[PDB]
Write a structure and sequence with these properties.
Elements (H helix, E strand, L loop, with lengths): L1 H16 L5 E5 L6 E7 L10 E7 L10 E4 L29 H13 L9 H9 L1 H15 L2
Antiparallel strand pairs: 1-2, 2-3, 3-4
EC number: 2.3.2.23, 2.3.2.24
Keywords: ATP-binding, Nucleotide-binding, Transferase, Ubl conjugation pathway
GO molecular function, one term: ubiquitin-protein transferase activity
């Protein structure tokens, strides 16, 4: 409804007024409920140099239910699968209307930096993350080269 639209416009403006400087997000075209985002691979992570695209769909009762967020760029990560689905608490059970797209993107950035052990969406990548970090990093760097450059 009108309340959701007002809140989405405010967040769009929040992002413009205080640009995050490694992420961006906004409407695809003229549809305020469907956004795109980009996250730069964090420096000192195996994703460094990559640019990762996301899609965001806001529900009509936003901000009281979470947006749906998925990657469109392929990535080697324990908590993000080949469909681009993201296992992240705040997108499910831990959503609050105090959260914003800006905070979601920062949380996803932090997730890239430090995966969650309890949530293996891709069990084999989770396993290599836990057992052979140097191998995980090598492969995550190779996938950044292959998909995110």
């Amino acid at each position: 409804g009108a309340m959701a639209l007002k809140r989405i416009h405010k967040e769009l403006n929040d992002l413009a007024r205080d640009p995050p400087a490694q992420c961006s997000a906004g409407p695809v075209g003229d549809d305020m409920f469907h956004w795109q985002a980009t996250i730069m691979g964090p420096n000192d992570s195996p994703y460094q140099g990559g640019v990762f695209f996301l899609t965001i769909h806001f529900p009509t009762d936003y901000p009281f239910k979470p947006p749906k967020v998925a990657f469109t760029t392929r990535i080697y990560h324990p908590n993000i699968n080949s469909n681009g689905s993201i296992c992240l608490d705040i997108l499910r059970s831990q959503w609050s209307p105090a959260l914003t797209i800006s905070k979601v993107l920062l949380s996803i950035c932090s997730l890239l930096c430090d995966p969650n052990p309890d949530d293996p969406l891709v069990p084999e990548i989770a396993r290599i993350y836990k057992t052979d970090r140097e191998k995980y990093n090598r492969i995550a760097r190779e996938w950044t080269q292959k998909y995110a450059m």
